[PDB]
Amino acid sequence: LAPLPPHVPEHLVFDFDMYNPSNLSAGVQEAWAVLQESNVPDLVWTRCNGGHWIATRGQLIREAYEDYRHFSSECPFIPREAGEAYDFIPTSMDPPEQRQFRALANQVVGMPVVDKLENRIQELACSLIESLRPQGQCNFTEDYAEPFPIRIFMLLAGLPEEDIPHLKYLTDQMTRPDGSMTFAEAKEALYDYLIPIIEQRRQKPGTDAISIVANGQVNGRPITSDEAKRMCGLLLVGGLDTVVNFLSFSMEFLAKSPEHRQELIERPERIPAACEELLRRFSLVADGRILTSDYEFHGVQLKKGDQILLPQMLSGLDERENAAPMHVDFSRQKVSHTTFGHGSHLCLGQHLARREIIVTLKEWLTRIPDFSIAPGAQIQHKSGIVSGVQALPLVWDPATTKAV
Ligand code: HEM
Numbered sequence: 001l002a003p004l005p006p007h008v009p010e011h012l013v014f015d016f017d018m019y020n021p022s023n024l025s026a027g028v029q030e031a032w033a034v035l036q037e038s039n040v041p042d043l044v045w046t047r048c049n050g051g052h053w054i055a056t057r058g059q060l061i062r063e064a065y066e067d068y069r070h071f072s073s074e075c076p077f078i079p080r081e082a083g084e085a086y087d088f089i090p091t092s093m094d095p096p097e098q099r100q101f102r103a104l105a106n107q108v109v110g111m112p113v114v115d116k117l118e119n120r121i122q123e124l125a126c127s128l129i130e131s132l133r134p135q136g137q138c139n140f141t142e143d144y145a146e147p148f149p150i151r152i153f154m155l156l157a158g159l160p161e162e163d164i165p166h167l168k169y170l171t172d173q174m175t176r177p178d179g180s181m182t183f184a185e186a187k188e189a190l191y192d193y194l195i196p197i198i199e200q201r202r203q204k205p206g207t208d209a210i211s212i213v214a215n216g217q218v219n220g221r222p223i224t225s226d227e228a229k230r231m232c233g234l235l236l237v238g239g240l241d242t243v244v245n246f247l248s249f250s251m252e253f254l255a256k257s258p259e260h261r262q263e264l265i266e267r268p269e270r271i272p273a274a275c276e277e278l279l280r281r282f283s284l285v286a287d288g289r290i291l292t293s294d295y296e297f298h299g300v301q302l303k304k305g306d307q308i309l310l311p312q313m314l315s316g317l318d319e320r321e322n323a324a325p326m327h328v329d330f331s332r333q334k335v336s337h338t339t340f341g342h343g344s345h346l347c348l349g350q351h352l353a354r355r356e357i358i359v360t361l362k363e364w365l366t367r368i369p370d371f372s373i374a375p376g377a378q379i380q381h382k383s384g385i386v387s388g389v390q391a392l393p394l395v396w397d398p399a400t401t402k403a404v
């Protein structure tokens, strides 16, 4: 526990630990939802992880994400030392500078790009599922979820298949840290892979995402090799652990709820709406901002340089946003959430993520309609900037399946 700064009133202190919440064994979302019990203020201070504010309700979370002038992305991670070394583009920049880097990134992951990849995503999901289907078991996280988005990235970025294991090792080193290296060391190792590929593609550009990025124009002039490197790093990692962990939460729920499975089996047209409801219920990202100046925010004095966690996860779990928030209903009329963020940094990959999810659910339920959590397995959750599932052992009877 970091000593309480003098400006923080005692009555706002709730020592929530975002990397190890108590009651984690009851499910991550549940463990974070304690921040929304009736005696917890809308805005609290925790002494864990260096000390930082947490906005606990959707209204404040949305408002802080809109107000980039007070709530800067310059240092977006807890703890402070990780936010400080983090330099990805555009996640470490504020508007107005961020605006055009965002425009460039959007050329590479936005809607028209997704509509063209739809089928390649489908062929990938199918071959992954078909290879598992006859075995009657998998670790979903390891055998389907992890191989999936890295392979879509390679397709986007025109990178060779043989690179996957190496790239996977580099990204895991950054995003699942075991404490053996600082974030800054993990970032440099990743940059060491990207640096030469950018050089090559600035000299000899093709039509992959890295060529488009490394040769784009920003705020009047050509992008620097440094800026391109910083963008490509985010393009790579931004779609990995979010998608892996999200698919894992989703499949865990479907494995545990035959009634919801059946609903989607009998009514496949509801899969896109079911995807949205799952995005809300199993929301999983929690980053934040640093105060650019002293600022009174909903009655609370915030001090220049204070960090604030603004959990994207919590908005849609908030009773004030969605009634009976822990309950899953695929026919919910107004599914509100900020699972992909809010304000100027609203996830550029959201459209690709939804096709990854929808395609996964469609293809899986079609080939393996009936599945369960392996007998005797207890599912372990992990908590962090991107919360997740440690392992997801699934079982099915292969006779209830069909090759398609
Ligand atoms: C379930 C899947 C996903 C979730 C939950 C998610 C979540 C988020 C969130 C919360 C942010 C805002 C971060 C902030 O404001 O600091 C963000 C931004 C971003 N995401 Fe995603 N994301 C997902 C998938 C993807 C994919 C597949 C890509 C493709 C590479 C991607 C690329 C990006 C990029 C480039 C940004 C930065 C936008 C900017 O700063 O202007 N994301 N995402």
Ligand SMILES: CN(C)c1cccc2c(S(=O)(=O)NCCCCCCCCNC(=O)[C@]34C[C@H]5C[C@H](C[C@H](C5)C3)C4)cccc12
Binding pocket: 019, 049, 050, 077, 078, 079, 081, 082, 088, 091, 174, 175, 177, 178, 179, 183, 234, 237, 238, 239, 242, 285, 287, 385, 386
């Ligand atoms: C102070 N002390 C002692 C400490 C205490 C506790 C833990 C510590 C840790 S730690 O081991 O817990 N590490 C926490 C930092 C994790 C960094 C992962 C970021 C990369 C994912 N990137 C994205 O860009 C994105 C950016 C954006 C949000 C999100 C999803 C997408 C979109 C991709 C993330 C390290 C060091 C010190 C620690």
Ligand SMILES: [K+]
Binding pocket: 074, 075, 076, 083, 084, 085, 086, 087, 092
């Ligand atoms: K920084």
